[PDB]
Amino acid sequence: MLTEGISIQSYDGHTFGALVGSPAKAPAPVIVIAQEIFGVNAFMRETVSWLVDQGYAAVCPDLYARQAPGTALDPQDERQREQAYKLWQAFDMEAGVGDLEAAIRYARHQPYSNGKVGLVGYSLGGALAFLVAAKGYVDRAVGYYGVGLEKQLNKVPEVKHPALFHMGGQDHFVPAPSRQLITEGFGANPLLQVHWYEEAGHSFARTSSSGYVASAAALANERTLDFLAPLQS
């Protein structure tokens, strides 16, 4: 689901829609939420609701609009998971970073904005949160279980603003040598914070996942909110 009539223009003219949640009380910082591989679906709506309940505004851009606008997939339906994997495989990461930059710009100038913008991503969005952090487009970035971060370690010194990452210890997208490479490499830049959750894999913060872990989801979530709180005016 997306908010009817919201259209944001990216760097190459491609346009995309977004799910927007205005804040309980304005002015407030705006959080751009970077989706998993399922489009702007139930978990994105729940994440918008959560951040609004915590005093933020939120904007979740339709990142699959370059391939299929308005895609919103149920991660519990096998056929939809299959479509999600095909969209992820064809996803242009560089164009995704550009769409996020355009949504972050849109976020800064909304009537209810206090001028500070944060980004929270999960999954594809967690990998995107690291690329956005290396670019410096936001005041603070958060990534949950981003895939393939071990292949982007050369971007670690480009990070000039705080960025926080929650990684699962039983996430098999990140085997033991990849965890060591990420821990050592991120550890060279104090603006990067990474936490490992020993008993959790990916998607541990999503209640609909077979990988949901309540204790890990709650500790990561409170860390995320403590980390975003300095953006509140």
Side-chain angles (χ1 to χ4, degrees), residues 1-12 14-20 31-42 44-45 48 58-73 83 87 91-92 95-104 106 119-120 124-125 128:
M1 65 301 266
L2 302 170
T3 300
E4 211 188 344
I6 302 294
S7 182
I8 299 172
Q9 188 190 56
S10 203
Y11 65 92
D12 63 344
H14 160 67
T15 58
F16 55 85
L19 180 64
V20 174
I31 306 297
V32 172
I33 304 159
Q35 61 172 79
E36 300 176 294
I37 60 166
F38 305 103
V40 187
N41 72 357
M44 287 296 112
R45 187 207 71 67
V48 164
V59 177
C60 181
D62 189 20
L63 301 187
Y64 284 159
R66 294 171 177 274
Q67 300 161 249
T71 298
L73 302 163
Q83 173 69 342
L87 290 170
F91 190 79
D92 182 340
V97 170
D99 284 348
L100 281 171
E101 171 187 37
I104 286 150
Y106 171 95
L119 180 146
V120 179
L124 176 65
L128 291 163

Short mmCIF file of all heavy atoms in Angstrom, two decimals, residues 1-12 14-20 31-42 44-45 48 58-73 83 87 91-92 95-104 106 119-120 124-125 128:
data_model
loop_
_atom_site.label_atom_id
_atom_site.label_comp_id
_atom_site.label_asym_id
_atom_site.label_seq_id
_atom_site.Cartn_x
_atom_site.Cartn_y
_atom_site.Cartn_z
N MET A 1 0.82 -1.19 0.00
CA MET A 1 0.00 0.00 0.00
C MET A 1 0.86 1.24 0.00
O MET A 1 1.92 1.27 0.63
CB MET A 1 -0.93 0.02 1.22
CG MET A 1 -0.20 0.12 2.56
SD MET A 1 0.96 -1.23 2.83
CE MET A 1 -0.06 -2.38 3.75
N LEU A 2 0.39 2.27 -0.71
CA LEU A 2 1.08 3.57 -0.80
C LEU A 2 0.07 4.70 -0.53
O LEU A 2 -1.11 4.45 -0.53
CB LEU A 2 1.69 3.75 -2.20
CG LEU A 2 2.72 2.66 -2.67
CD1 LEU A 2 3.06 2.80 -4.12
CD2 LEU A 2 4.02 2.77 -1.80
N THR A 3 0.55 5.88 -0.17
CA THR A 3 -0.34 7.02 0.06
C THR A 3 -0.74 7.59 -1.32
O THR A 3 0.11 8.01 -2.08
CB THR A 3 0.32 8.10 0.91
OG1 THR A 3 0.69 7.53 2.19
CG2 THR A 3 -0.78 9.28 1.20
N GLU A 4 -2.04 7.58 -1.63
CA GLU A 4 -2.51 8.05 -2.95
C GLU A 4 -2.02 9.50 -3.23
O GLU A 4 -1.94 10.33 -2.30
CB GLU A 4 -4.03 7.91 -2.95
CG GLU A 4 -4.62 7.62 -4.40
CD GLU A 4 -6.17 7.68 -4.43
OE1 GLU A 4 -6.80 7.63 -3.32
OE2 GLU A 4 -6.74 7.84 -5.57
N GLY A 5 -1.53 9.74 -4.46
CA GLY A 5 -1.06 11.06 -4.89
C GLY A 5 0.37 11.47 -4.56
O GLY A 5 0.83 12.51 -5.03
N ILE A 6 1.08 10.70 -3.71
CA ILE A 6 2.46 11.04 -3.39
C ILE A 6 3.33 10.51 -4.52
O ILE A 6 3.24 9.33 -4.91
CB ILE A 6 2.92 10.47 -2.01
CG1 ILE A 6 2.01 10.99 -0.87
CG2 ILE A 6 4.40 10.80 -1.75
CD1 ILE A 6 2.04 12.47 -0.58
N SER A 7 4.08 11.41 -5.14
CA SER A 7 4.97 11.06 -6.26
C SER A 7 6.26 11.83 -6.06
O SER A 7 6.24 13.06 -5.95
CB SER A 7 4.32 11.43 -7.62
OG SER A 7 5.13 11.06 -8.75
N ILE A 8 7.36 11.10 -6.00
CA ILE A 8 8.68 11.64 -5.76
C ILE A 8 9.54 11.37 -7.03
O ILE A 8 9.57 10.24 -7.55
CB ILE A 8 9.32 10.94 -4.51
CG1 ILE A 8 8.49 11.17 -3.24
CG2 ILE A 8 10.76 11.35 -4.29
CD1 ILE A 8 8.97 10.33 -1.99
N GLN A 9 10.26 12.40 -7.48
CA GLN A 9 11.13 12.28 -8.67
C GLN A 9 12.58 11.97 -8.30
O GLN A 9 13.22 12.65 -7.47
CB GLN A 9 11.10 13.61 -9.50
CG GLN A 9 11.84 13.43 -10.85
CD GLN A 9 12.07 14.71 -11.62
OE1 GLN A 9 12.67 15.63 -11.10
NE2 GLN A 9 11.61 14.75 -12.87
N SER A 10 13.14 10.98 -8.97
CA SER A 10 14.51 10.64 -8.73
C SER A 10 15.45 11.37 -9.72
O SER A 10 15.00 12.06 -10.63
CB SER A 10 14.64 9.14 -8.86
OG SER A 10 15.75 8.75 -8.14
N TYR A 11 16.75 11.15 -9.55
CA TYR A 11 17.84 11.75 -10.35
C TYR A 11 17.71 11.64 -11.91
O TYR A 11 18.11 12.59 -12.60
CB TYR A 11 19.16 11.12 -9.87
CG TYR A 11 19.26 9.61 -10.16
CD1 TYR A 11 19.84 9.13 -11.36
CD2 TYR A 11 18.71 8.66 -9.26
CE1 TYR A 11 19.86 7.75 -11.68
CE2 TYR A 11 18.75 7.26 -9.55
CZ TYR A 11 19.33 6.82 -10.78
OH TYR A 11 19.44 5.49 -11.10
N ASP A 12 17.12 10.54 -12.42
CA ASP A 12 16.96 10.29 -13.86
C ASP A 12 15.53 10.52 -14.36
O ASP A 12 15.17 10.06 -15.48
CB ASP A 12 17.45 8.82 -14.18
CG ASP A 12 16.61 7.71 -13.49
OD1 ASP A 12 15.87 8.04 -12.54
OD2 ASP A 12 16.68 6.53 -13.93
N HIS A 14 12.79 9.10 -13.23
CA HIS A 14 11.88 8.01 -12.87
C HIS A 14 11.08 8.54 -11.66
O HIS A 14 11.66 9.23 -10.86
CB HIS A 14 12.72 6.81 -12.39
CG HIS A 14 11.95 5.84 -11.57
ND1 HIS A 14 10.93 5.07 -12.09
CD2 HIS A 14 12.03 5.53 -10.25
CE1 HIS A 14 10.40 4.34 -11.13
NE2 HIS A 14 11.05 4.60 -10.00
N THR A 15 9.78 8.26 -11.58
CA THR A 15 9.04 8.73 -10.45
C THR A 15 8.58 7.54 -9.65
O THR A 15 8.36 6.48 -10.22
CB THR A 15 7.78 9.59 -10.83
OG1 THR A 15 6.87 8.82 -11.68
CG2 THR A 15 8.23 10.89 -11.47
N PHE A 16 8.36 7.73 -8.35
CA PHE A 16 7.84 6.60 -7.55
C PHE A 16 6.93 7.13 -6.42
O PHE A 16 7.10 8.27 -5.92
CB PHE A 16 9.04 5.77 -6.99
CG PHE A 16 10.04 6.57 -6.20
CD1 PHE A 16 9.83 6.83 -4.82
CD2 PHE A 16 11.21 7.06 -6.82
CE1 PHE A 16 10.77 7.55 -4.08
CE2 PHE A 16 12.18 7.81 -6.09
CZ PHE A 16 11.96 8.05 -4.72
N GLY A 17 6.04 6.26 -5.98
CA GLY A 17 5.10 6.56 -4.89
C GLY A 17 5.68 6.23 -3.50
O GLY A 17 6.84 5.85 -3.39
N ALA A 18 4.92 6.47 -2.45
CA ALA A 18 5.46 6.19 -1.09
C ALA A 18 4.34 6.07 -0.13
O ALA A 18 3.25 6.64 -0.34
CB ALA A 18 6.43 7.33 -0.61
N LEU A 19 4.58 5.34 0.96
CA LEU A 19 3.62 5.28 2.08
C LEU A 19 4.11 6.32 3.07
O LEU A 19 5.28 6.28 3.50
CB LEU A 19 3.64 3.90 2.75
CG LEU A 19 2.63 3.77 3.93
CD1 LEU A 19 1.12 3.93 3.43
CD2 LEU A 19 2.84 2.37 4.48
N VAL A 20 3.24 7.27 3.44
CA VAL A 20 3.68 8.36 4.32
C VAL A 20 2.86 8.38 5.61
O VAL A 20 1.66 8.17 5.60
CB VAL A 20 3.53 9.73 3.58
CG1 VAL A 20 3.83 10.91 4.47
CG2 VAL A 20 4.52 9.78 2.40
N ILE A 31 11.66 9.86 9.16
CA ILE A 31 12.45 8.65 8.95
C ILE A 31 12.06 8.03 7.61
O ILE A 31 10.90 7.72 7.38
CB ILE A 31 12.23 7.60 10.06
CG1 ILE A 31 12.49 8.21 11.46
CG2 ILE A 31 13.17 6.39 9.82
CD1 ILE A 31 13.99 8.72 11.75
N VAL A 32 13.03 7.87 6.73
CA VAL A 32 12.77 7.20 5.44
C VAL A 32 13.02 5.70 5.74
O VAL A 32 14.04 5.38 6.34
CB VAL A 32 13.77 7.66 4.37
CG1 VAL A 32 13.61 6.80 3.07
CG2 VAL A 32 13.46 9.12 4.05
N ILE A 33 12.04 4.85 5.44
CA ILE A 33 12.17 3.42 5.69
C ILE A 33 12.45 2.74 4.37
O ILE A 33 11.69 2.87 3.38
CB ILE A 33 10.86 2.81 6.28
CG1 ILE A 33 10.48 3.57 7.57
CG2 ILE A 33 11.08 1.32 6.57
CD1 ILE A 33 8.98 3.41 7.93
N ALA A 34 13.55 1.99 4.36
CA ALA A 34 14.01 1.22 3.19
C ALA A 34 13.51 -0.23 3.37
O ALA A 34 13.90 -0.95 4.32
CB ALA A 34 15.63 1.33 3.06
N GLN A 35 12.62 -0.65 2.45
CA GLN A 35 11.94 -1.98 2.42
C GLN A 35 12.84 -3.22 2.40
O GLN A 35 14.05 -3.15 2.13
CB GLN A 35 11.05 -2.01 1.15
CG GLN A 35 11.88 -1.86 -0.15
CD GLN A 35 11.06 -2.07 -1.41
OE1 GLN A 35 10.33 -1.16 -1.82
NE2 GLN A 35 11.19 -3.27 -2.06
N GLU A 36 12.21 -4.37 2.73
CA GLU A 36 12.81 -5.69 2.58
C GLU A 36 12.61 -6.03 1.07
O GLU A 36 12.31 -5.14 0.29
CB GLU A 36 12.03 -6.69 3.42
CG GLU A 36 12.00 -6.41 4.92
CD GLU A 36 11.12 -7.43 5.64
OE1 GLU A 36 9.90 -7.40 5.39
OE2 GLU A 36 11.63 -8.23 6.47
N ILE A 37 12.65 -7.29 0.67
CA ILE A 37 12.48 -7.64 -0.75
C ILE A 37 11.00 -7.84 -1.09
O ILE A 37 10.71 -8.30 -2.20
CB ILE A 37 13.26 -8.97 -1.12
CG1 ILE A 37 12.72 -10.12 -0.26
CG2 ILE A 37 14.78 -8.78 -0.84
CD1 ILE A 37 13.18 -11.61 -0.79
N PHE A 38 10.07 -7.44 -0.19
CA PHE A 38 8.63 -7.68 -0.44
C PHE A 38 7.82 -6.45 -0.84
O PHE A 38 6.60 -6.51 -0.81
CB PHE A 38 8.00 -8.37 0.80
CG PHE A 38 8.72 -9.64 1.17
CD1 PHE A 38 9.61 -9.65 2.25
CD2 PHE A 38 8.53 -10.81 0.40
CE1 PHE A 38 10.35 -10.87 2.61
CE2 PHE A 38 9.25 -12.03 0.72
CZ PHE A 38 10.15 -12.05 1.81
N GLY A 39 8.49 -5.35 -1.20
CA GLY A 39 7.75 -4.15 -1.56
C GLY A 39 7.30 -3.39 -0.32
O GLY A 39 7.72 -3.69 0.86
N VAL A 40 6.31 -2.51 -0.52
CA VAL A 40 5.78 -1.71 0.62
C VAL A 40 4.54 -2.43 1.06
O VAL A 40 3.42 -2.20 0.52
CB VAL A 40 5.50 -0.23 0.21
CG1 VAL A 40 5.12 0.65 1.48
CG2 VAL A 40 6.71 0.37 -0.42
N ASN A 41 4.74 -3.37 1.99
CA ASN A 41 3.70 -4.26 2.45
C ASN A 41 3.30 -4.09 3.93
O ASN A 41 3.51 -3.05 4.51
CB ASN A 41 4.18 -5.70 2.11
CG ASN A 41 5.32 -6.17 3.01
OD1 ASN A 41 5.80 -5.40 3.85
ND2 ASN A 41 5.73 -7.42 2.85
N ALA A 42 2.74 -5.13 4.52
CA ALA A 42 2.23 -5.12 5.90
C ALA A 42 3.27 -4.73 6.94
O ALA A 42 3.06 -3.81 7.74
CB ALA A 42 1.63 -6.49 6.21
N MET A 44 6.03 -3.00 6.32
CA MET A 44 6.33 -1.56 6.14
C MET A 44 5.28 -0.68 6.79
O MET A 44 5.65 0.29 7.50
CB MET A 44 6.45 -1.24 4.63
CG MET A 44 7.83 -1.85 4.04
SD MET A 44 9.31 -1.08 4.79
CE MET A 44 9.95 -2.50 5.75
N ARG A 45 4.00 -1.05 6.64
CA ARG A 45 2.94 -0.24 7.27
C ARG A 45 3.08 -0.26 8.82
O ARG A 45 2.94 0.78 9.48
CB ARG A 45 1.56 -0.80 6.86
CG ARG A 45 0.36 0.12 7.36
CD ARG A 45 -1.00 -0.63 7.59
NE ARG A 45 -0.98 -1.52 8.78
CZ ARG A 45 -0.89 -1.15 10.09
NH1 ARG A 45 -0.93 0.12 10.49
NH2 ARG A 45 -0.84 -2.11 11.03
N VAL A 48 5.89 1.97 9.80
CA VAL A 48 5.47 3.38 9.76
C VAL A 48 4.69 3.71 11.04
O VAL A 48 5.02 4.70 11.71
CB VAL A 48 4.62 3.67 8.46
CG1 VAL A 48 3.85 4.97 8.56
CG2 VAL A 48 5.56 3.70 7.24
N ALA A 58 7.17 9.40 8.94
CA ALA A 58 7.86 8.33 8.21
C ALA A 58 7.51 8.35 6.74
O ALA A 58 6.41 8.72 6.38
CB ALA A 58 7.53 6.92 8.80
N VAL A 59 8.46 7.96 5.90
CA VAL A 59 8.22 7.92 4.45
C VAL A 59 8.80 6.57 3.94
O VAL A 59 9.98 6.32 4.16
CB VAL A 59 8.98 9.06 3.69
CG1 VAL A 59 8.76 8.92 2.14
CG2 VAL A 59 8.47 10.46 4.14
N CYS A 60 7.98 5.71 3.33
CA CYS A 60 8.49 4.46 2.82
C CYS A 60 8.29 4.47 1.32
O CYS A 60 7.19 4.20 0.84
CB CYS A 60 7.77 3.28 3.50
SG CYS A 60 8.40 1.70 2.90
N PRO A 61 9.37 4.69 0.57
CA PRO A 61 9.34 4.75 -0.91
C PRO A 61 9.18 3.42 -1.59
O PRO A 61 9.69 2.38 -1.10
CB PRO A 61 10.67 5.39 -1.26
CG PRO A 61 11.62 5.01 -0.13
CD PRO A 61 10.70 5.07 1.12
N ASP A 62 8.50 3.46 -2.73
CA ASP A 62 8.24 2.28 -3.54
C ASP A 62 9.53 2.00 -4.36
O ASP A 62 9.62 2.34 -5.56
CB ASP A 62 7.03 2.60 -4.41
CG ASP A 62 6.52 1.39 -5.16
OD1 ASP A 62 6.85 0.28 -4.72
OD2 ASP A 62 5.82 1.49 -6.21
N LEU A 63 10.48 1.26 -3.76
CA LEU A 63 11.76 1.01 -4.46
C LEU A 63 11.64 0.03 -5.65
O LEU A 63 12.52 0.06 -6.52
CB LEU A 63 12.85 0.58 -3.44
CG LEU A 63 13.19 1.54 -2.28
CD1 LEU A 63 14.40 0.98 -1.52
CD2 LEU A 63 13.59 2.93 -2.87
N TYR A 64 10.57 -0.78 -5.72
CA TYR A 64 10.39 -1.69 -6.83
C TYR A 64 9.62 -1.03 -7.97
O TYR A 64 9.36 -1.71 -8.97
CB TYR A 64 9.61 -2.95 -6.42
CG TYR A 64 10.40 -3.96 -5.63
CD1 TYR A 64 9.74 -4.90 -4.82
CD2 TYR A 64 11.82 -4.09 -5.82
CE1 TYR A 64 10.44 -5.99 -4.24
CE2 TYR A 64 12.57 -5.17 -5.20
CZ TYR A 64 11.85 -6.11 -4.44
OH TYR A 64 12.56 -7.20 -3.98
N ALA A 65 9.39 0.29 -7.87
CA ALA A 65 8.68 1.02 -8.94
C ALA A 65 9.44 1.00 -10.28
O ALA A 65 8.77 1.07 -11.32
CB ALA A 65 8.29 2.48 -8.53
N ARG A 66 10.78 0.81 -10.30
CA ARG A 66 11.50 0.76 -11.59
C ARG A 66 11.21 -0.55 -12.31
O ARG A 66 11.49 -0.68 -13.54
CB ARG A 66 13.02 0.93 -11.42
CG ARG A 66 13.42 2.28 -10.92
CD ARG A 66 14.86 2.39 -10.54
NE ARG A 66 15.18 3.76 -10.14
CZ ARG A 66 15.53 4.75 -10.97
NH1 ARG A 66 15.74 4.51 -12.28
NH2 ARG A 66 15.80 5.96 -10.48
N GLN A 67 10.68 -1.54 -11.58
CA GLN A 67 10.36 -2.84 -12.16
C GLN A 67 8.84 -3.12 -12.20
O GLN A 67 8.34 -3.64 -13.20
CB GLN A 67 11.05 -3.93 -11.33
CG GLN A 67 12.55 -3.78 -11.32
CD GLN A 67 13.22 -4.54 -10.19
OE1 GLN A 67 13.76 -3.91 -9.25
NE2 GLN A 67 13.20 -5.86 -10.27
N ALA A 68 8.12 -2.82 -11.11
CA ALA A 68 6.69 -3.11 -11.02
C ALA A 68 6.13 -2.23 -9.93
O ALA A 68 6.08 -2.65 -8.75
CB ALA A 68 6.46 -4.63 -10.66
N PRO A 69 5.61 -1.04 -10.29
CA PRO A 69 5.03 -0.11 -9.30
C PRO A 69 3.92 -0.73 -8.46
O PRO A 69 3.15 -1.53 -8.96
CB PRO A 69 4.47 0.99 -10.17
CG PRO A 69 5.31 0.93 -11.41
CD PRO A 69 5.39 -0.53 -11.66
N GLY A 70 3.92 -0.42 -7.15
CA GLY A 70 2.86 -0.86 -6.25
C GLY A 70 2.93 -2.32 -5.82
O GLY A 70 1.90 -2.87 -5.39
N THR A 71 4.09 -2.95 -5.96
CA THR A 71 4.26 -4.36 -5.56
C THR A 71 4.22 -4.41 -4.01
O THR A 71 4.87 -3.56 -3.35
CB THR A 71 5.62 -4.93 -6.10
OG1 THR A 71 5.64 -4.91 -7.53
CG2 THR A 71 5.80 -6.36 -5.69
N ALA A 72 3.41 -5.29 -3.44
CA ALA A 72 3.27 -5.45 -1.98
C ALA A 72 2.99 -6.94 -1.77
O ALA A 72 1.88 -7.42 -2.03
CB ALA A 72 2.10 -4.60 -1.42
N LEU A 73 4.04 -7.68 -1.38
CA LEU A 73 3.99 -9.15 -1.31
C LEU A 73 3.90 -9.69 0.09
O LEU A 73 4.45 -9.13 1.05
CB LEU A 73 5.25 -9.70 -2.04
CG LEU A 73 5.39 -9.27 -3.51
CD1 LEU A 73 6.75 -9.48 -3.98
CD2 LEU A 73 4.42 -10.06 -4.43
N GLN A 83 8.08 -14.37 -6.41
CA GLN A 83 8.12 -13.09 -7.15
C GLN A 83 9.08 -12.11 -6.44
O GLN A 83 9.80 -11.36 -7.08
CB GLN A 83 6.69 -12.51 -7.20
CG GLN A 83 6.61 -11.12 -7.78
CD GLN A 83 6.90 -10.93 -9.30
OE1 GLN A 83 7.51 -11.79 -9.98
NE2 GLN A 83 6.52 -9.75 -9.82
N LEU A 87 12.38 -10.17 -8.15
CA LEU A 87 12.55 -8.70 -8.06
C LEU A 87 13.85 -8.32 -7.38
O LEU A 87 14.57 -7.43 -7.86
CB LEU A 87 11.35 -8.08 -7.34
CG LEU A 87 10.01 -8.13 -8.16
CD1 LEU A 87 8.90 -7.72 -7.26
CD2 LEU A 87 10.09 -7.19 -9.36
N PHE A 91 17.11 -6.30 -8.99
CA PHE A 91 17.16 -4.93 -8.40
C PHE A 91 18.51 -4.22 -8.62
O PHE A 91 19.61 -4.79 -8.41
CB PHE A 91 16.89 -5.06 -6.86
CG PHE A 91 16.69 -3.73 -6.17
CD1 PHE A 91 15.45 -3.09 -6.28
CD2 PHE A 91 17.72 -3.13 -5.42
CE1 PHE A 91 15.21 -1.85 -5.67
CE2 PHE A 91 17.50 -1.90 -4.79
CZ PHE A 91 16.21 -1.25 -4.93
N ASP A 92 18.39 -2.96 -9.09
CA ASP A 92 19.54 -2.12 -9.33
C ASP A 92 19.84 -1.39 -8.03
O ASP A 92 19.20 -0.41 -7.73
CB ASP A 92 19.15 -1.16 -10.48
CG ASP A 92 20.28 -0.22 -10.88
OD1 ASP A 92 21.23 0.01 -10.10
OD2 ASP A 92 20.21 0.29 -12.04
N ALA A 95 20.65 2.41 -8.46
CA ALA A 95 19.42 3.21 -8.67
C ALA A 95 18.60 3.25 -7.36
O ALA A 95 17.90 4.26 -7.09
CB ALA A 95 18.56 2.65 -9.83
N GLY A 96 18.72 2.19 -6.54
CA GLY A 96 17.99 2.20 -5.27
C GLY A 96 18.53 3.27 -4.32
O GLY A 96 17.81 3.92 -3.57
N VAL A 97 19.83 3.45 -4.34
CA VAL A 97 20.48 4.43 -3.50
C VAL A 97 20.03 5.82 -3.96
O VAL A 97 19.75 6.67 -3.13
CB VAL A 97 22.05 4.29 -3.55
CG1 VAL A 97 22.74 5.48 -2.86
CG2 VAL A 97 22.49 3.02 -2.89
N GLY A 98 19.91 6.01 -5.29
CA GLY A 98 19.44 7.28 -5.85
C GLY A 98 17.98 7.57 -5.54
O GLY A 98 17.64 8.72 -5.19
N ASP A 99 17.15 6.53 -5.48
CA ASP A 99 15.74 6.72 -5.14
C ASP A 99 15.64 7.10 -3.66
O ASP A 99 14.81 7.96 -3.31
CB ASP A 99 14.93 5.43 -5.44
CG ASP A 99 14.66 5.26 -6.95
OD1 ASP A 99 14.89 6.22 -7.75
OD2 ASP A 99 14.32 4.16 -7.37
N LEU A 100 16.47 6.46 -2.80
CA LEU A 100 16.48 6.78 -1.39
C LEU A 100 16.94 8.22 -1.19
O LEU A 100 16.35 8.93 -0.37
CB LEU A 100 17.36 5.82 -0.59
CG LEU A 100 16.56 4.51 -0.38
CD1 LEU A 100 17.62 3.49 0.22
CD2 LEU A 100 15.33 4.66 0.58
N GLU A 101 17.94 8.66 -1.96
CA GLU A 101 18.42 10.08 -1.84
C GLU A 101 17.29 11.03 -2.13
O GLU A 101 17.12 11.98 -1.36
CB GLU A 101 19.56 10.37 -2.82
CG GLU A 101 19.97 11.90 -2.91
CD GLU A 101 21.00 12.21 -4.03
OE1 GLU A 101 20.92 11.60 -5.13
OE2 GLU A 101 21.89 13.08 -3.78
N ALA A 102 16.48 10.74 -3.16
CA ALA A 102 15.32 11.54 -3.58
C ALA A 102 14.22 11.52 -2.52
O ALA A 102 13.59 12.54 -2.28
CB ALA A 102 14.77 11.08 -4.89
N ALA A 103 14.01 10.38 -1.84
CA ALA A 103 13.01 10.30 -0.78
C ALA A 103 13.49 11.05 0.47
O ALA A 103 12.67 11.69 1.15
CB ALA A 103 12.76 8.81 -0.43
N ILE A 104 14.80 11.05 0.74
CA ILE A 104 15.40 11.75 1.89
C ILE A 104 15.27 13.27 1.65
O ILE A 104 14.84 14.00 2.55
CB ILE A 104 16.88 11.37 2.10
CG1 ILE A 104 16.98 9.95 2.68
CG2 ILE A 104 17.60 12.39 3.04
CD1 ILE A 104 18.27 9.19 2.27
N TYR A 106 12.96 14.69 -0.21
CA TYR A 106 11.52 14.91 -0.08
C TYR A 106 11.15 15.02 1.40
O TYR A 106 10.37 15.91 1.80
CB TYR A 106 10.75 13.77 -0.77
CG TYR A 106 9.25 13.76 -0.51
CD1 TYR A 106 8.33 14.36 -1.42
CD2 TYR A 106 8.71 13.11 0.65
CE1 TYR A 106 6.91 14.30 -1.17
CE2 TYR A 106 7.34 13.06 0.90
CZ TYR A 106 6.46 13.65 -0.02
OH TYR A 106 5.15 13.56 0.31
N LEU A 119 17.24 7.25 8.42
CA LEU A 119 16.84 6.18 7.53
C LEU A 119 16.95 4.86 8.34
O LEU A 119 17.93 4.63 9.06
CB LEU A 119 17.78 6.12 6.29
CG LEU A 119 17.41 4.98 5.28
CD1 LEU A 119 17.65 5.30 3.82
CD2 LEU A 119 18.22 3.76 5.56
N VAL A 120 15.95 4.01 8.18
CA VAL A 120 15.95 2.69 8.77
C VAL A 120 15.63 1.75 7.62
O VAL A 120 14.60 1.93 6.92
CB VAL A 120 14.89 2.55 9.91
CG1 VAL A 120 14.93 1.08 10.47
CG2 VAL A 120 15.27 3.56 11.06
N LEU A 124 17.08 -6.06 2.05
CA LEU A 124 17.63 -5.20 1.01
C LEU A 124 17.88 -3.76 1.51
O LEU A 124 18.88 -3.14 1.15
CB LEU A 124 16.47 -5.23 0.00
CG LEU A 124 16.65 -4.34 -1.23
CD1 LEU A 124 17.81 -4.84 -2.07
CD2 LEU A 124 15.37 -4.30 -2.07
N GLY A 125 16.93 -3.26 2.31
CA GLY A 125 17.02 -1.91 2.88
C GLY A 125 18.16 -1.69 3.85
O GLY A 125 18.61 -0.51 4.01
N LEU A 128 21.11 -1.22 1.67
CA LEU A 128 20.96 0.13 1.15
C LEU A 128 21.30 1.16 2.21
O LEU A 128 21.91 2.17 1.88
CB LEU A 128 19.54 0.38 0.61
CG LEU A 128 19.30 -0.45 -0.68
CD1 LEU A 128 17.77 -0.53 -0.94
CD2 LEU A 128 20.01 0.25 -1.91
#
